Amino acid sequence: LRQRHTELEREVSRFEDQTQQQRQQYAQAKESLTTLNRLIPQVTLLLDET
């Protein structure tokens, strides 16, 4: 059971790393979305060699 606890701690560390990463990139992606969705979403019409 002590080994079980050791491996459980290992898994805790892995999950912590994964969660911090994924949430950070997801926030950044949300921000980039906001930019595109708000500003760009259709203005390519105008950008289209008008």
Next chain:
Amino acid sequence: LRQRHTELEREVSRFEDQTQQQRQQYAQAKESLTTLNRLIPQVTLLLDET
């Protein structure tokens, strides 16, 4: 424990509902936002009601 189950179920029901409504409102928020994203960027200015 069965009483605990019933009470936890009450609480979980409340959260399930709150989510069920909430998401409607906030999906509608992003939806109206998409409507604005479609309208304003240039369309409101060429469809400026000339």
Next chain:
Amino acid sequence: RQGRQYQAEDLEALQNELEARQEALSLSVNEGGERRMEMRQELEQLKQK
């Protein structure tokens, strides 16, 4: 969809505000979403017990 005239002649600024409103989405859906999750396990645990 929004109001019924809703200053459509010139709504510009509100778009920004709407985005602000939309931010609450994150919390309002996110929070309970784990709460259910959370208690569900306990229910499961309690079930197991």
Next chain:
Amino acid sequence: RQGRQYQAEDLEALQNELEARQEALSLSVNEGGERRMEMRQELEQLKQK
């Protein structure tokens, strides 16, 4: 700000990529939180044993 360059000829691809990932956002946060807290209670049962 993001990437390095993407053809103005197609915004839609970027829209769809971000759509997919932001859809994965909620799922990923649920995954992380639930699995970690569940294995934490597992830790607790191990402790008592």
